[PDB]
Amino acid sequence: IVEGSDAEIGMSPWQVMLFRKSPQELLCGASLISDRWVLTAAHCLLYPPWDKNFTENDLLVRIGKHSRTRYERNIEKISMLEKIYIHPRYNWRENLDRDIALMKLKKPVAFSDYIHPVCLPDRETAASLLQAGYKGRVTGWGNLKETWTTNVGKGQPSVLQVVNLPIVERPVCKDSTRIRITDNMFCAGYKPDEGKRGDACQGDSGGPFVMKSPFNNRWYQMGIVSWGEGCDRDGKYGFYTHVFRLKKWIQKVI
Amino acid sequence: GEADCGLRPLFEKKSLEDKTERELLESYIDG
């Protein structure tokens, strides 16, 4: 998360960490939506085609964490994945459309002050909240600055970062990139003139983009961190998977 | 489960508000 800030303890009890020791190559976020299901981006589970690997597992889902590096004993829980379901129409070498993936945990997790599921949006919520100018929250352990290897100053955060960004008008998203966006994704972030910065960056993908309903006091997952050209660039915005438009697939699979 | 999804133990259930939460509410009231 670029230009974000340290989250407080228990701020996002639905934040899940996708980690892999060997190859270390993995850090992605995910969201806890039930005691047995985690939601992430389809691209965090794939490999380049010349790898020829399709087993997809050996990954650890660490739930309840705050610190990126430290092991949190009586707080975090590590679980194994029983099954992984990637949207059969996710397209990388194409539109980057339908970047969504669900994961069934081996055994259901047990909630606590640090672990708790987010609500998924319903027609009404989608209508009330998904409006240009309306702010959402993005959390993650990803890079603090745009980086291809190493960067100046610190690079990765020690604790979960949070940043609240505004949903941007579709036309503006459309005119901000050459990649053909689809109704299944939305963009958020500040415009250059709004004197505020913030963005998701490498390591944040899969994490949740949430909004609090001013009507029922509940947090809803409206998007999933997916892509963006760089991190926190002027005139550029981050794109998120439109959870509401994929809600039916989520339901069907579960 | 879903029944009480979205209500964070250390916050909503305690009638506590995190430090930047209101910035979100403000943007809904004409943002």
Binding site: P23, Q24, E25, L26, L27, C28, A41, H43, C44, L46, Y47, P48, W50, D51, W92, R93, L96, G142, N143, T147, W148, T149, I179, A200, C201, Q202, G203, D204, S205, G206, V225, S226, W227, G228, E229, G238 | -
Partner: protein, 58 residues
């Protein structure tokens, strides 16, 4: 020495943090870079071994 070994490492638009290896032609050795999860260019290897076997010299 395939042409794609001379190309610089490409992270891409996606935001995952996938540590990978690329052939650094200028140094003549394979190094790690952060790949984003999508739109991988070919100089993107699972391991240094695979990296060297495919790009050893370029």
């Amino acid at each position: 020495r395939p042409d794609f070994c001379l190309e610089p490492p490409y992270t891409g638009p996606c935001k995952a943090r996938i540590i990978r290896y690329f052939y650094n032609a200028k140094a003549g050795l394979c190094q790690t870079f952060v790949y984003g999860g999508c739109r991988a260019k070919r100089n993107n290897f699972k391991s240094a071994e695979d990296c060297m076997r495919t790009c050893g010299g370029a």
